[PDB]
Amino acid sequence: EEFFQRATDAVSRRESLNGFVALSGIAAIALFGLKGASTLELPITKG
Amino acid sequence: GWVTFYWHWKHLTLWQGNVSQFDESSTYLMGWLRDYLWLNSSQLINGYNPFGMNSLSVWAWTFLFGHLVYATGFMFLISWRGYWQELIETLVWAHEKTPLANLVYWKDKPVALSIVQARLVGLAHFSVGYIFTYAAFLIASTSGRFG
Amino acid sequence: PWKQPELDPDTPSPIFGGSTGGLLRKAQVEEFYVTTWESPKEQIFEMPTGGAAIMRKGPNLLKFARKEQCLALTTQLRTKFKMTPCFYRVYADGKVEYLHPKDGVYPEKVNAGRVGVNQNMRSIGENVDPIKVKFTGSQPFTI
Amino acid sequence: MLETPVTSAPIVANYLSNLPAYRTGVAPNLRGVEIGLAHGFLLAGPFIKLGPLRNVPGAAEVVGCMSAAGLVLILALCLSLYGNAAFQSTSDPLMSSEGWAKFAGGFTVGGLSGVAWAYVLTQV
Amino acid sequence: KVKIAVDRNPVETNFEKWAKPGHFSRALAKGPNTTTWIWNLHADAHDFDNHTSDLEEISRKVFSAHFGQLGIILIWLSGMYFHGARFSNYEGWLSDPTHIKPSAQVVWPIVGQEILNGDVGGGFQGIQITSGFFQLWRASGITSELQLYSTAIGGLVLAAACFFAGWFHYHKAAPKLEWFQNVESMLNHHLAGLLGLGSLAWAGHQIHVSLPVNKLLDAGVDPKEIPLPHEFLLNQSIIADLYPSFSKGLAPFFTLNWAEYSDFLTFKGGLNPVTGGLWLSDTAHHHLAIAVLFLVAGHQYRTNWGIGHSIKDILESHKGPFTGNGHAGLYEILTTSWHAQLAINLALFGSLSIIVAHHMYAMPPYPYLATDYGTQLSLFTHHMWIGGFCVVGAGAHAAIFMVRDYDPTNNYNNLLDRVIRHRDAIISHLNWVSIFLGFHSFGLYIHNDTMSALGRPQDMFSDTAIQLQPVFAQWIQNTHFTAPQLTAPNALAATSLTWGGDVVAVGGKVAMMPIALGTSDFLVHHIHAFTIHVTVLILLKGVLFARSSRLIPDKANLGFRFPCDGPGRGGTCQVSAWDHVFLGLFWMYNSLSIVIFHFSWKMQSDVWGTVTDSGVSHITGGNFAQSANTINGWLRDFLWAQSSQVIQSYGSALSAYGLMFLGAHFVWAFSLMFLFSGRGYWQELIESIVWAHNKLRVAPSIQPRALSITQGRAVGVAHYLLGGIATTWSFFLARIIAVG
Amino acid sequence: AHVVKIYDTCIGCTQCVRACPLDVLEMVPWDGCKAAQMASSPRTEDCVGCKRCETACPTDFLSVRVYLGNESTRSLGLAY
Amino acid sequence: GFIGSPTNLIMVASTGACLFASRFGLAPSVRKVAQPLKLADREVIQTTGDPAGFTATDVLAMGAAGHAIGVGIVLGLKGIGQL
């Protein structure tokens, strides 16, 4: 019962969860392209 | 649409040098349908196919896009309100009387769009489809055979 | 009327099975309407929210989510059997409001007791132009 | 008002009762964790099945798993948006504002956990 | 109990009511004052339920109207036979049915329309007909034009008899309400004499007339050298050497040695290789079995002699535990409401027309029918559209019955009351399944179009990238291909060639060949299922919500045909059941348009074509497996690859089709402002025109008014459907005649 | 809610009240007509704007008028 | 059709059994209908010198049923190799 209780403790609040999801989405979107693409032979940076 | 059809066909026949084709073909509407709407659409619809793809694939896609938005304009234009209000009422009952999904509820009650709003949305879809379809056909026909 | 009747929730409901066009979540959140009448005999009627029900000989109580359904049932009972029913409105907190026979003689009559409100003492078409009432919040028909 | 054998069966009532959404008493973070685990585990499948890089060995699983994790993130964001929009004003604690926020946090935690579990299950 | 109940002379045969146009209703009895009255005169003309409240007079009017429609149909059939007798090349077509096109309409040379009299062959000029009357007359043993003339004269005589019967059974001897309400007697007489005796008479005609003439025609002898049908009828020598079992002379029928009749009552499935049609002996044994089965079925209901079933008892006895009163009040409903019977009849007749279209594209039951691709395509499309219109009218008249003839006293806990009691769940689940079908079919099409335009042929839902093969349909095809092998051992071949097998061709053209089903076939079949589901949703929502709803609780008091309830409750336009039928008419049009497009492309790509030494070369080269998965493929490889014959038909005999084509587009456009706009704009424009005519003192005494909202919707849907049907008709016929 | 306005051209025929499906109109005593009746709208918050009262009005133009605007739960005819 | 033929014999036996059946119970006659069984009923049609209810419509209906049962049994046996 200890698990899955304090895991969400620092993300339970609305501001923290919104900031975390925005930061993760922005980081994953920025990683896409120059790092997310051109490694899995995505046919947009090849030419 | 009439003035742009006239401009496009006359100028296409002028650029091709076959002005006599427009002179002897714009008299009757079958010439408009065949020598302009059907003859110049060969390169447009061949933008993408199972055989391959040329540079006019985007123009074919947005041509079908415009025909679809025209069709959605018809969707919003023919039917007016009452069927959609009763359908939304039935959907409201379906959402309210089911487990595992009635916990989440709407803050604002879903209603059918107003008749003025119906005319506005149908007009907007109609005009968007008209513009996109004619722009696609015009650019694809004028660029597939000319530079 | 002479004395406004009070809503009795213990009055029996008419003989009816399950309902689908009946009460939604608006009944437990917002107001819902309740129609009562006094059937002299056992008879079958048609509800405006679905199929057919059978009213009991005596007091009959029905619940609807809209006032239009209550007045539709009221006029069906008045045209078919001359029943003279009446419906109340019950809010979420339990406030009961008397709606249809405000003077107890039905709005077709006059009773010489009501006060005419929202009446314009000018002819229609004598209203001022919308330019006359601009940036004032008053409509030409509201004066 | 129209009761049916489908909606009033004892087996259906018992199956709906032990679900995390309709549990009798359980903290909302645990309900969110179970919801995220189950829904991420089922969502990972179609993303690794017929994704854009399905024919590429190895890349299909990781691409589908990150796609499922991103979809879980958007689902958590929309869950928080619903919680802020619907429960901004004022006896079940999950329907409350901070209860729904804890449910959303448990949901994203469980979704990430389910995506990771699907990855480590399809890797072996 | 069952007896004839007839009133003598209730209506006098006078012309005094022909002078006054509006006489059936009290609203139109006062005369006209506005122009809409005229439309009302042409709207409630045959609404007999509104003219009088007496069911007996309504039933008499229905009987006489049916007699009038039968007379009209017989006049049309006699005209068809007369056109085949005089302005036709049927005798020339009988010599070489594979080279002369069927033609039965000849135009007058007036303004250059004589170019429509094309060179059909056989030294004749006329319009190439696609009705298949030539193949029907060849199946009926008709050889000369004298038989067609006699059939036309007999049809005219029967039409005059039917019109006289309508006049007599209305004005002179009108049946009472008890006569019409004998549903058991009606069902027994219809099953035994209208269907069973008709099937037996047609089987006797096939056995004694059609089979020998068709056998001699397939033998290759001259049609004039063929003996007349009465020679086969009377002298038994020709039928004896044509069929040895006729030498016994009705002995094997009464001695129960029916196997001796196996020569001319066969079970050879498939098609006759000489003519590419169904075997005539198979059709003879079929109609004989149908006659026997219907004769058996016509002695089921008790009428006057104790034995037999009771419809009311059967309905009341079938009561399950989950349905309450099982089929209790339906007997009183269907014996008092004409509209419920009309709904049932229209639904079953439309479904029957759909089965007819499917089962005569599949098996061509006529000699040299499959070789004429245009005839088969036209017959399929025509029966398709008639079935769709009939099943729309089924929902329309069911909604009319729900509005008018429904009584809550007789329906408390029966099946209809429970359907009304969970109509919201029905409509919600139907809406959900319609949305799911539309997504997982049309979104699949859009997905294919996008991934084709994105340069991902491996990401498509095609036969090469992602195989969504119809495994159930393929398994059923394989099972029916092996139906004569194990499960129907007495059948010589398969019941049709669509399941599999060899290719039957006549005259170098493919009569029937096996049809392969792929990813595109699954996509279009699920698209058709989605469109049918949505049309069912619209019509069922119209029927079930015709009386009341949470939005409008007193919709029954507003009638079946009302425009709206005003802009209240946000707006209540098109809320009536009539408006639901008006909306569902377009959905039926879209559904059947997609269905016939799939049919035309499928037979043009994978069935029809020519047979060479190398193999079968189809019309479009079999592009349906590769081009039917995308909307752009339907635009280009089906609508643009075809329709070139329609636009290039000018200067030829097909040009009128193209003319009709253009005109059809016009009509399809001309409907739109009746479908759009409203009434107040046209009313104000009419007011301005009234001012203009009043300035010149030429304002009419009858006040001109704009069309009603219901009237405007009806005009719009009628012109829209006419334009679309005529567009498909012209395009289909021109494409299938120019290259077929 | 919608606005229901009644003018002096009303003849007190009680047709608008009978056509009203939500009991918005009423008849009050009056002296400006032969029938000594005048239409009133004391329950205009329950009106949906169906314009059934205007359909039943026998006078030329309209003695009763419905003006839409500011839709509510009761004005939109919603059971939910 | 031959006199003494086995097909004629079996179909005549079936027709005679059907005729003698409703004379005493079992088969639904005019005076015996019910849903599963035989229940008492009227006559309407005179039996023309026949005891109980055995009128002309009864013998017509049961002769048709007997002829049909006989031809069905005969052709079913002929299909499987018997008479």
Ligand code: CLA
């Ligand atoms: C202009 C806006 C835009 C942009 C930039 C994209 C970009 C993309 N979409 Mg598209 N899409 C859009 C609008 C857009 N979309 C719209 C409007 C629709 C609806 C009509 C779609 C419908 C759509 C479908 C149906 C699919 C895509 C897919 C894709 C991807 C193409 C294939 C690829 O590179 O795989 C790169 C794959 C990766 C895994 C690399 C990382 C990028 C991921 C997807 C984003 C991050 C995930 C998320 C935040 C959770 C991660 C949490 C954690 C791991 C950080 C790409 C990321 C495909 C896809 O992603 O496959 C599932 C796909 O199948 N899109």
Ligand code: CLA
């Ligand atoms: C299923 C049938 C169908 C339908 C319903 C549509 C629907 C549409 N198509 Mg598409 N089309 C289709 C099949 C279809 N298409 C096929 C199979 C092809 C061949 C591949 C095309 C080729 C095509 C082209 C090339 C164009 C369309 C256009 C349009 C739009 C019509 C806009 C409008 O209302 O113009 C109203 C009608 C007109 C403006 C004139 C009609 C055409 C006449 C014959 C030209 C002559 C007019 C001239 C001035 C004289 C007339 C005056 C009058 C007084 C007599 C709409 C999105 C057009 C578009 O996108 O918008 C302009 C367009 O340019 N389509």
Ligand code: CLA
């Ligand atoms: C076995 C006897 C018999 C036969 C063959 C028919 C045949 C027919 N009936 Mg009828 N019916 C019968 C007994 C019979 N009825 C009885 C006993 C009753 C009362 C319970 C009814 C009550 C009834 C009604 C209420 C209606 C019909 C209708 C019809 C027609 C259906 C349309 C059709 O299939 O087109 C087939 C068309 C043809 C084959 C063309 C030739 C038609 C010929 C002229 C009719 C010949 C059959 C006739 C019954 C012979 C006796 C008439 C005699 C006095 C001259 C059809 C002509 C409908 C109708 O009015 O249609 C006009 C209709 O609405 N029937």
Ligand code: CLA
């Ligand atoms: C409705 C369908 C139909 C019809 C009309 C016929 C008719 C005929 N068939 Mg066919 N047949 C049929 C179905 C039919 N059959 C079927 C389903 C089969 C099973 C496959 C056969 C199998 C079959 C075989 C194998 C043969 C025939 C033969 C015959 C002929 C013999 C007639 C006969 O014995 O019947 C009985 C007929 C009557 C008893 C006549 C009716 C009584 C009359 C009309 C009374 C008139 C009285 C009148 C009031 C007084 C005179 C009036 C005057 C003063 C004006 C005849 C042309 C035989 C043939 O061609 O040889 C000639 C033959 O070999 N048929």
Ligand code: CLA
């Ligand atoms: C078995 C067939 C059958 C029968 C007996 C009836 C009988 C009836 N129907 Mg039903 N109906 C049917 C089929 C049938 N219908 C079908 C198939 C449909 C679907 C389209 C409908 C749809 C329908 C509706 C929507 C309504 C009816 C109504 C009616 C009633 C009066 C009809 C009337 O007065 O029209 C009078 C005749 C006309 C108005 C003429 C119609 C002409 C059409 C619109 C255009 C003609 C098209 C033509 C082929 C092309 C012309 C081209 C031009 C250049 C010449 C009556 C009870 C009405 C009613 O009030 O019911 C109680 C009603 O509202 N029916």
Ligand code: CLA
């Ligand atoms: C071709 C034209 C057209 C189209 C596409 C639609 C579409 C629709 N109508 Mg309509 N209809 C039309 C014309 C049309 N209408 C006309 C002219 C009329 C007048 C008679 C009607 C009458 C009518 C009735 C009476 C009914 C409908 C219904 C429907 C729905 C169909 C059910 C379904 O599965 O939709 C699914 C949606 C589509 C097929 C639209 C295209 C979806 C594509 C594939 C996009 C997929 C999602 C996309 C990727 C997301 C975009 C992301 C973006 C936001 C960034 C849908 C909303 C029914 C309804 O409400 O639902 C059952 C209904 O009852 N319509």
Ligand SMILES: CC1=C(/C=C/C(C)=C/C=C/C(C)=C/C=C/C=C(C)/C=C/C=C(C)/C=C/C2=C(C)CCCC2(C)C)C(C)(C)CCC1
């Ligand atoms: C005892 C006695 C006696 C005797 C009696 C007898 C002996 C009887 C018999 C009877 C009989 C013995 C009868 C029979 C009848 C029959 C019938 C009536 C039949 C019918 C048939 C039919 C209808 C058929 C049909 C068919 C066909 C044709 C086809 C298909 C199949 C079938 C089969 C269905 C006397 C009188 C002396 C005296 C007193 C006592």
Ligand SMILES: CC1=C(C/C=C(\C)CCC[C@H](C)CCC[C@H](C)CCCC(C)C)C(=O)c2ccccc2C1=O
């Ligand atoms: C155009 C239009 C009108 C106006 C059209 C009207 C009033 C009907 C006009 C019918 C005419 C009179 C038919 C006859 C036309 C010709 C005079 C006849 C042929 C003449 C040649 C043979 C010479 C409406 O009233 C209307 C109402 C509701 C929805 C949409 C609309 C709508 O779109």
Ligand code: SF4
């Ligand atoms: S008048 Fe016309 S726009 Fe207004 S509610 Fe009626 S149908 Fe709709």
Ligand code: SF4
């Ligand atoms: S319908 Fe018109 S005239 Fe009649 S009482 Fe109402 S407002 Fe007055």
Ligand code: SF4
């Ligand atoms: S619009 Fe309708 S609800 Fe409103 S006052 Fe008029 S009749 Fe009553």
